[PDB]
Ligand binder design. Sequence first.
Ligand SMILES: CC(C)(C)OC(=O)[C@@H](N)CCC(N)=O
Ligand SMILES: [Zn+2]
Length: 321
Amino acid sequence: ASAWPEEKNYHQPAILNSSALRQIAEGTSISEMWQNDLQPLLIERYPGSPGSYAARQHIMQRIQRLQADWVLEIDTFLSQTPYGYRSFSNIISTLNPTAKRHLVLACHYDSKYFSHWNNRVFVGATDSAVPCAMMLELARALDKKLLSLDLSLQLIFFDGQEAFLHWSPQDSLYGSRHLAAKMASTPHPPGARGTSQLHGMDLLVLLDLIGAPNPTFPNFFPNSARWFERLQAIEHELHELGLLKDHSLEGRYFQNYSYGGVIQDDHIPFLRRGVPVLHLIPSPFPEVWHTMDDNEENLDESTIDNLNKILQVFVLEYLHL
Ligand SMILES: CC(C)(C)OC(=O)[C@@H](N)CCC(N)=O
Ligand SMILES: [Zn+2]
């Protein structure tokens, strides 16, 4: 039996030199992302709504225009909810579908349901319109390098992350609970006898609640800590080369501390099935968490810009591009 599923345990990154780093920093455009990827997503988009459909089309359209050979799949399913049976649609974008191993970046594109209050609508700017846009900007910014692509890249935009009422084991993580179970029972690579698509998940990098000022991301798991350190190293180098905006080491995003317990998110259904996770959610959460103020006005542009550069470098180094 092949031990390829163990390759992830020994995988090392291909570190970019100073020259390559300035190039990545110059390759991403925060204003471009803002107008073309984020704003169309700042709409009410709870599951089943017109917005959900519009968001899903935007994400697909934005990926299809790229040169990289992206394969888009809409994973639609039914699930019981506090309001009865409903339909959900996860969006999966994969480069090299048969590539045994894949680095996976993810977030949820649905927005928590709230009945209109004082003519205000909840759009979950940091939760998680920004993460969505960041993934799209990354796809755009590294498009040329990704075009050259047994390890590849995959993006997952989960639907139904939010609870329709208040968090509950049965009410929340609809999309991820469904996709995890599905991938866990789908042979991979095609024709495989005893390995699943989950065996193929090298690492799940989940972005959530990003876009607020001064985020502090803690290290959550020992089996992905070496990767958390890479993010620290990248942030440090990008900073020393003066490639970050209004950024200080004292107030850096990736600090030297782990988090005791765990935070409920889309990674749970995967983590509980053995998938290594790098959970990029800040602790504490943005002040605007689940408030009508989690809007565009309260987003920190330079912070998102800095994070884009960091994430993009991490991905290129992980994929040896
Ligand atoms: C629905 C649940 C509670 C699972 O997740 C969220 O609200 C995430 N937006 C943020 C993560 C969190 N646990 O607050
Ligand atoms: Zn939320």
